């Protein structure tokens, strides 16, 4: 099912062998993280919001850490990071005051 | 043909340089007392 009220960022990511960056688009909601492909326009990965550990926030590239899900690391660079880092938190916030124990 | 070594070598810099250089963030899902 497609939900309404969607915000799109987008950010650059680097590819294997090769040492360049190419356009992707990125799609982030209340309850989960997507990547969707500039060309093909579908999804091929996502992660749960709640699944989330810690993350790093600099000037011009966004940082992941994942728990027990990823075996990698995920970096992409940004050119609204700080709008990024706010936008996860405060949806951090709005769980916690619905499941409170 | 004309071939780039200014552009690519200036942004793969700046991109490896502020990673390492980041502060991190936890968040309160994980931690119970602070």
Redesign the interface.
Same mark, same amino acid.
């Given at each position: 099912p497609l939900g309404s009220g969607v915000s799109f960022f987008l950010v650059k990511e680097?590819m294997k062998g090769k040492? /360049?960056?190419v356009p992707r688009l990125l799609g982030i909601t209340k309850e989960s993280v997507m990547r969707v492909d500039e060309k093909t326009k579908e999804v091929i990965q996502e992660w749960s919001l709640?699944n +989330? /550990?810690?993350?790093?926030?600099?000037? /011009? =590239?966004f940082?992941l850490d994942f728990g027990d899900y990823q075996d990698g690391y995920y =970096?992409v660079?940004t050119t609204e990071g700080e709008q990024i880092?706010q936008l996860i938190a405060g949806y +951090?916030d709005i769980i916690?005051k619905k499941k409170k124990s | 043909k004309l071939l780039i070594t200014i552009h690519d070598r200036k942004e793969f810099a700046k991109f490896e340089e502020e990673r390492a250089r980041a502060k991190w963030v936890y968040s309160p899902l994980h931690y119970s007392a602070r």
């Open positions: 680097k040492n /360049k960056l709640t +989330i /550990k810690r993350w790093a926030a600099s000037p /011009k =590239s940082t =970096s660079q880092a +951090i916690l | -």
